């Protein structure tokens, strides 16, 4: 109901400005006679009333305002001369009416314009041009004021309508931009376009290679027993915020966060040759930060980290409550290796060795060999 309010506001301001223009005209007149004054009180009163009575219903009220305007100007112009400037007002109004009325009434609007034109061709001929009523000069000043008012009314009304339109656009763009930013945060951009379409299809993407890291907390049930639930949720949020910012720095992706468990995936939105190295370095950094960060109890929070690597499948499932997801054998391997991983350590398999031994340090202990860290030498 916004197109509404644009129309109604411009009509109200237009009525106010015309009344203001007419009153100055009014006081200026001297020895002009009250045969005009009787019509003149009527015109001013009706113009002032229509904005106060613009509830009665429908589009008939704005049209009644114009009926009054046309009748008033015709009546004044007939008695006075053509040189006064009744002619210029009809021309302003012809352009103004189309702006005032909405698009579904364009045809009607066009007719009104024609009606105005029909008067003007008559106005030069039928009206006795230059019928002079009392002082002459005073009609000098009337013509000049007519020109200036005809310009100013149109300028102000047009500018006001433009202001409403631009401003509605501004609030609009902000209101949309916030939601778009949130959606962009929630999901990768490419898949968002696929979601938006009304156009239902399965999203399945096959990826030759990828790597998954799973991290979990130890003895969380303990720490829950001795702490209030509300405080515990805050602690979890703090921890995961720090981890999220580290991830965003490394450029890797996290699909989801489930309770204690934290999941990271490398290279599915885009493949890269060195995904495994990046994941290993990120895991080392995460262990450092975790050994750092502190819980309300004051005990350190150990984390078990398991890494797996292999092909994966990505895409949403369901018809409701979507999220990016991932799948593959590597996920099973990662969940396993995290589950059996010791406190404060990182566990990886025969594969993850092939790729990380050249380029990182692992040893000791399917068979699994612990990931110490990166090589000091460079």
């Amino acid at each position, epitope marked *: 109901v916004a197109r509404r309010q644009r129309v109604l506001t411009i009509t109200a301001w237009l009525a106010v400005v015309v009344t203001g223009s007419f009153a100055l005209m009014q006081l200026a007149t001297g020895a002009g006679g009250w045969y005009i004054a009787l019509i003149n009180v009527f015109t001013a009163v009706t113009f002032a009333i229509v904005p106060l009575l613009h509830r009665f219903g429908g589009l008939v009220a704005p049209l009644t305002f114009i009926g009054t305007a046309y009748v008033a100007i015709f009546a004044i112009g007939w008695d006075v001369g053509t040189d006064a400037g009744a002619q210029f007002f009809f021309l302003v109004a012809a352009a103004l009416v189309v702006l005032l009325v909405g698009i579904e009434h364009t045809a009607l609007a066009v007719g009104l314009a024609a009606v105005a034109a029909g008067l003007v061709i008559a106005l030069e001929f039928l009206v006795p041009p230059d019928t002079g009523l009392q002082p002459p000069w005073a009609m000098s000043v009337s013509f000049v004021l007519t020109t200036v008012s005809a310009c100013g009314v149109a300028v102000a009304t047009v500018w006001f309508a433009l202001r409403d339109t631009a401003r509605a656009e501004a609030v609009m763009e902000a209101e949309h931009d916030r939601s778009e930013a949130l959606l962009a945060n929630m999901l990768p951009a490419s898949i968002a376009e696929r979601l938006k379409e009304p156009e239902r299809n399965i999203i399945a993407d096959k990826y030759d290679e990828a790597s998954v890291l799973f991290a979990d907390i130890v003895g969380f049930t303990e720490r829950a027993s001795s702490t209030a639930p509300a405080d515990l949720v805050r602690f979890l949020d703090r921890l995961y915020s*720090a981890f999220d*910012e*580290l991830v965003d*720095q*490394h*450029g890797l992706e996290k699909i989801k966060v489930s309770g204690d468990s934290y999941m990271v995936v490398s290279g599915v939105p885009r493949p890269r040759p*060195d995904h495994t*190295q*990046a994941l290993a*370095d990120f895991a080392l*950094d995460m262990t*450092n*930060v975790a050994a*750092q*960060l502190k819980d309300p109890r004051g005990n350190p929070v150990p984390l078990r980290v398991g890494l797996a690597t292999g092909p994966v499948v990505a895409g949403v499932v369901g018809s409701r409550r979507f999220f990016y997801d991932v799948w593959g054998d590597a996920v099973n391997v990662a969940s396993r290796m995290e589950s059996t991983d010791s406190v404060g350590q990182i566990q990886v398999p025969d594969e993850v060795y092939e790729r990380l031994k050249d380029d990182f340090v692992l040893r000791e202990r399917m068979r699994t060999w612990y990931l110490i*860290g*990166r*090589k*000091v*030498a*460079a």
Partner: nanobody
Amino acid sequence: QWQLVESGGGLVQAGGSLRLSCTASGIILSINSMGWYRQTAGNEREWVAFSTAGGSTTYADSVKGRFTISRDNAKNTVYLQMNSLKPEDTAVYYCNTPAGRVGGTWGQGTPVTVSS
């Protein structure tokens, strides 16, 4: 004494160029990732650059293509080339590892001012 000292900040016009240097004592840079941070006052300090152990780097969106992070092992230092400098980049710049980053154990940084 595990410390990181910054240097190279100062006074420059819009569109100039700087090289902020970061030297650390107490650790080995080759086995560490790394970040350049910056405080204006309207916020806590927002990470603009990051370089990992292995050569990978990343940047904030507001700054990418303009500032470059580079390294010196034989040194134990990190550098930030800075280009196309502007009033929004007038700030106070710090340099760290994630561990010190998260523990609050930081230096004073270095001031950078962009104005005529």
